[PDB]
Design a protein around this ligand. Structure first.
Ligand SMILES: COc1ccc([N+](=O)[O-])cc1Cn1cc(CC(=O)O)c2ccc(-c3cc(N)cc(N)c3)cc21
Ligand SMILES: [Ca+2]
Ligand SMILES: [Ca+2]
Lengths: 440, 427
């Protein structure tokens, strides 16, 4: 392991190097290009499909280089020594295929969505055996990072005085041309935009579900958005974010739920970053502080196992090997060590209904395997799902499976039916909790 | 900011990131005093940092220009007295214990009106700080190879067989079990945790100390589980909230301090389960709840006065962050009226966490002549209990395990539930 602000030279024998470098300095473009120029074959991994496809187009337009591009929706093979791929497509491709790459760049290695973590873990477990010389863990914001001040951005502490209440402070009359306003939830987007629209401001709301097309492509506007997202004259930031957490609630087992926390440094820099691009921008904030970057929640580990089982045909023990490699590697975001627990949970979930899994994968549920497995248990007990929320629509053949209480394995959302807590799988998960979660 | 802030011309709040060395309560305050300024230095404690030696409050070290005190004494003294000091140094301002947070918040809210010219927020570990290497300490990852299982890894007998070693576990139960395993292998292992003191052989024979963070000789190596137990609040709606303890990865302050009990003078070895840590700079909402509790129980502070001090804290950049629940907690404690003064006196004197919350739950039990949620030691102010053995507990909130059956219909419960829906986002 090594620490760099400049591209690590290819060593003679295998090594993992940390690259901490600004976003503009072309981690995903100049770095792989300089490696390609030395004659190496380079894989560049990114969380985002749009980023991945976007690097292909840039390299073509700016350098007449047509890289291979590998994403879920689109795959291009040119034979270039440079390959751009998403973490998710990399995992679908089986991970590291022997002899293909000399160098693997794990870009935005600070990313803590499940795909990045399983993806980087997989690279770390497999790259050396596959014949890679160098693995580069690249990010502009390593663990512990805090937001630094931006030359072109005015940062203005908010206060009490204004004609709209904003998160314990106030958004004043005046300074809402084109502005972006970050709220933590969809409903406070709608309610703040319904307020601004009735106030005569051309304000429109965005969040997941809505399509970006609904946003006024230039011309005076005030956008009220979650993180689920042109450039603006200023950014206004509630400084909080809604994140997914697991609660070991013992009712009977665990709960996946959401929590509102102060934003971490990655959130703040990004939200701030939507202004001041070339032209001087202004940043308004409810709160002066922020969590440092570099932690993620145990619920993301659950996701990795869910995706391993649902998308990538990994036995839980195989997903554990990849994730263990991630957690044994220094300089990466950290999480509770719950690998044994989640491996245990998922290993106990046998003979899932393949049709139900296909539907939950199709409909884009957050834990397709967990959802399809609960529905599997419900159908075979001829019991109802835990609610009739759209999450459970693979059971719409409702009419027979109404017999009584729900055999509740875990809580993935609100539970509305009456429940029974003595299913063998429920008891199995409880035993895994006693076995693998540390007490006190 | 790496060196003492020059005294400004109008009131300012400066920060001092100083090295792990070059003390900020000992060399830095002297330089301010040599310029005619009256300096107040606040720390969590004025016991010598080593654990041995003079108190910092020692006369010469008295009509002197430098006063050494604590956040706890400062709050009990009523905060800032008018015109008493030019410079107030809030040292160790990364501390996220309730007393430190309420104390610093008080300094920030009051200093300028008291005529201070400068407030210095000094720490060796500003928010985002990560553990840095140590010239004198070799660090080695534990593998899965070894006789002694240890948090998913293993300790080889060789690295602790003979010599003097310190091993951190996250709980008493874990220390007992590990010590037992080691003794059964012919190791001289002693367990240490809250309430023992001296069984750690003051000798320097071979020994393996298995300990929590309760620990106050010296060691050839440290082995770290890299986890800690912390107090958290759960908004569980059963009926209201729960103060509970949970296990979490250690942060950089904890890692640095644990690792630091080896490599004192002679070289040392640090062996770890996890290569990483939580970065420092965040604390739980339950600490805010503690501030209001302590405000009501100890400092004669109306909730709105606690809010003012806490708000000053949260408006100041460079300090640990927390969820903005001031309005929620202020609202909760505002509703808690007519506490029985005699139960409060007892929960205060027994050293319980949340004495105001314990005594208030007890008060509500005595009036409805209902039993406490359990008979754990927490509820002993009620021990004259034969009358109030009747019926379910009017449960306000959960401060521990609940064994009696409960009613959720008390007005105070409803009130706190409503505060949750309106002041948080948790219905
Ligand atoms: C909604 O999809 C997901 C959502 C979450 C996760 N996860 O947390 O790991 C993984 C996936 C699966 N996934 C995420 C990507 C990234 C991308 O869209 O480029 C991807 C890409 C390809 C495949 C894939 C494609 C085929 N033909 C077959 C299989 N088994 C997977 C699955 C892929
Ligand atoms: Ca809970
Ligand atoms: Ca919870």
């Amino acid at each position: 392991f090594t620490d760099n602000s400049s591209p690590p030279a290819v060593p003679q024998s295998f090594q993992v190097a940390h690259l901490h470098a600004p976003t503009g300095s072309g981690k995903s473009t100049k770095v792989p290009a300089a490696y390609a120029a030395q004659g190496y074959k380079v894989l560049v991994l990114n969380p985002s499909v749009a980023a991945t496809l976007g690097f292909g187009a840039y390299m073509s337009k700016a350098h007449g280089v047509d890289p291979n591009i590998r994403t879920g929706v689109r795959t291009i093979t040119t034979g270039s020594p440079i390959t751009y791929s998403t973490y998710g497509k990399f995992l679908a491709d089986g991970g590291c295929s022997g002899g293909a790459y000399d160098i693997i760049i794990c870009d935005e290695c600070h990313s803590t969505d499940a795909t990045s973590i399983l993806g980087i873990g997989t690279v770390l477990d497999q790259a050396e055996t596959a014949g890679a010389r160098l693995v580069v863990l690249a990010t502009a914001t390593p663990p512990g990072s805090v937001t630094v001040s931006h030359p072109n951005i005015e940062e203005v502490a908010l206060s009490t005085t204004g004609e709209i209440p904003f998160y314990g402070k106030a958004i004043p009359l005046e300074v809402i041309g084109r502005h972006l306003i970050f709220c933590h939830s969809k409903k406070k987007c709608d309610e703040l935009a319904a307020k601004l629209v009735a106030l005569g401001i051309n304000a429109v709301a965005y969040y997941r579900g809505l399509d970006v097309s609904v946003i006024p492509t230039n011309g005076d506007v005030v956008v009220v958005s979650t993180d689920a997202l042109g450039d603006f004259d200023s950014v206004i930031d509630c400084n909080t974010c809604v994140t997914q957490t697991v609660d070991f609630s013992l009712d009977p087992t665990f709960t996946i739920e959401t929590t509102t926390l102060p934003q971490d440094a990655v959130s703040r820099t990004q939200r701030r970053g939507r202004t001041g691009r070339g032209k001087p921008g202004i940043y308004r904030f409810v709160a002066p502080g922020e969590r440092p970057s570099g932690m993620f929640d145990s619920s993301v580990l659950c996701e990795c196992y869910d995706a391993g089982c649902a998308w990538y045909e990994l036995m839980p023990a195989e997903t554990t090997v990849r994730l263990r490699a991630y957690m044994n590697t220094p300089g990466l975001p950290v999480c509770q060590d719950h690998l044994e627990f989640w491996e245990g949970v998922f290993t106990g979930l046998t003979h899932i209904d393949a049709h139900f899994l296909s539907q939950t994968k199709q409909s884009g549920e957050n834990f397709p395997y967990l959802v399809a497995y609960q529905a599997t248990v419900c159908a075979r007990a001829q019991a109802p799902p835990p609610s009739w929320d759209q999450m459970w629509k693979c059971l719409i053949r409702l009419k027979p499976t109404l017999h009584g209480p729900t055999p509740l394995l875990y809580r993935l959302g609100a539970v509305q039916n009456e429940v029974t807590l003595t299913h063998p799988i429920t008891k199995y998960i409880m035993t895994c909790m006693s076995a693998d979660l540390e007490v006190v």
